[PDB]
Amino acid sequence: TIHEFKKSAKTTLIKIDPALKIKTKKVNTADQCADRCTRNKGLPFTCKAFVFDKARKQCLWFPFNSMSSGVKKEFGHEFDLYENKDYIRNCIIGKGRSYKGTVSITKSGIKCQPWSSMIPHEHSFLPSSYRGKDLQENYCRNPRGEEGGPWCFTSNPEVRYEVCDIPQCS
Amino acid sequence: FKKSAKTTLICKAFWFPFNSMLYENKDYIRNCIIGKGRSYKGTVSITKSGIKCQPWSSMIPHEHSFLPSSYRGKDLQENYCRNPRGEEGGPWCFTSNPEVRYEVCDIPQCSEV
Numbered sequence: 001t002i003h004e005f006k007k008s009a010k011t012t013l014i015k016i017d018p019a020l021k022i023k024t025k026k027v028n029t030a031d032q033c034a035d036r037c038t039r040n041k042g043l044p045f046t047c048k049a050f051v052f053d054k055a056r057k058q059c060l061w062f063p064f065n066s067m068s069s070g071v072k073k074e075f076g077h078e079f080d081l082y083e084n085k086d087y088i089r090n091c092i093i094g095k096g097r098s099y100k101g102t103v104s105i106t107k108s109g110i111k112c113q114p115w116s117s118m119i120p121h122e123h124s125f126l127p128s129s130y131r132g133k134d135l136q137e138n139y140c141r142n143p144r145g146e147e148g149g150p151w152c153f154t155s156n157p158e159v160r161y162e163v164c165d166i167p168q169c170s
Numbered sequence: 171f172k173k174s175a176k177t178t179l180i181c182k183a184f185w186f187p188f189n190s191m192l193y194e195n196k197d198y199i200r201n202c203i204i205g206k207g208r209s210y211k212g213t214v215s216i217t218k219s220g221i222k223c224q225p226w227s228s229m230i231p232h233e234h235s236f237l238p239s240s241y242r243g244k245d246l247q248e249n250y251c252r253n254p255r256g257e258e259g260g261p262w263c264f265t266s267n268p269e270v271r272y273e274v275c276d277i278p279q280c281s282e283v
Contacts, residue, residue: 045220046276067282087278090201094283098283103197109181167198169280 002034005050005082007104008066008136012051012079015064015071020045023061033059034082049083067100068144091169097145099166104152107165110136112152120157140164172196172213174247189263202280208256210277215249217273223249223263231268251275 023043027033030052036059037047052059065083066073073081078147090101104112115125115135125143127135133143134149140150151163174192182198183189189198191211196250201212215223226246236254238246244254251261251274262274 040216040220040222043220046216046218047220067278085196086201086212088201089278089280089282090197090199091280093280093283101197167200169200169202169204 001038002031002082004038005034005087006088006100006139007083008073008081008083008134010075010077010079011081012060012074012076013049013062013064013066013071014074015062015068015117020063025059026057028057030054030059030080030082033061037061037082037084047084048087049081050154052080052082054080058127058156068103089169091148091167093147093169095147096142096146096166099140099142099150100104100134102138103140103150103164103166103168105164106152106154106159107164108154108159108162110154110156110159110162112140112164113155114138115141115153121153121156121160123153125153140166172199197236200280202278203260204280204283206256206258207253207261207277210251210253210261211245212250212277214251214261214275214277216275217251217263217270218276219270219273221265221267221270221273223251223275224266225249226252226264231266232264232271234264236264251277 033050033052037050040047043061049062049065051117054107064071065087085102085123088101092099130143140152148163151161153161171193177192179190183194203210241254251263253261261272261277262272264272
């Protein structure tokens with residue numbers, strides 16, 4: 001069930017306010033955190049994201065994600081952020097500069113090449129050169145915010161790259 | 171996926187490059203709302219309080235008149251959050267908690283950048 005969440009390595013979330021209080025629990029694996037979050041079992045709120053503290057092998061369930069207002073991302077080696085896809089906008093507004101969904105296939109049904117890898121295609125689009133553009137896994141993205149919206153490097157050696165088909169909100 | 175018992179149109183959904191807009195891939199069904207949410211057709215099925223939603227076709231624990239038949243086109247399927255009357259408050263659902271009849275669901279607006 002953890003494959004249903006968008007993973008963001010070495011990241012945690014922080015939000016301050018009265019009302020809601022994060023839910024925590026020591027477990028053995030992150031999958032356990034995903035299971036409880038998906039089924040939303042025993043959670044006094046609707047879980048939009050969770051963090052697996054790989055150090056304390058602890059879990060943190062949040063009634064919010066990185067796009068929620070008043071929430072901040074923070075780097076952390078022991079942390080791993082998992083966001084529920086149902087709450088990450090799955091359509092784009094215009095050029096899709098800010099698209100952060102999990103679609104990872106071109107409009108030709110060709111699977112995408114991970115960004116941090118150079119096989120089969122060599123490129124200069126490494127995450128470290130685009131801090132803030134979320135170039136992870138093989139998710140379609142628009143790092144330079146160009147027309148033609150989100151795209152990715154196809155795994156097909158015959159095709160270097162190809163835009164992905166992501167619906168307009170309208 | 172978003173199941174729709176006994177149905178079909180005339181890989182987004184199954185295998186066509188489009189869907190009714192039966193199993194439909196959630197990535198190709200807008201998961202955010204514009205305004206009231208009258209047109210919302212996503213799969214969120216838990217309220218703003220974490221309570222799982224009661225199926226629309228069920229009369230327990232809460233008896234109601236929002237029958238799928240009386241609201242054809244409103245997609246009152248399973249226990250998905252909806253807003254069939256396009257009311258202010260946004261998509262909602264009857265809850266599985268006998269003490270809480272209904273409650274809105276926390277679905278974000280599209281134009282929320």
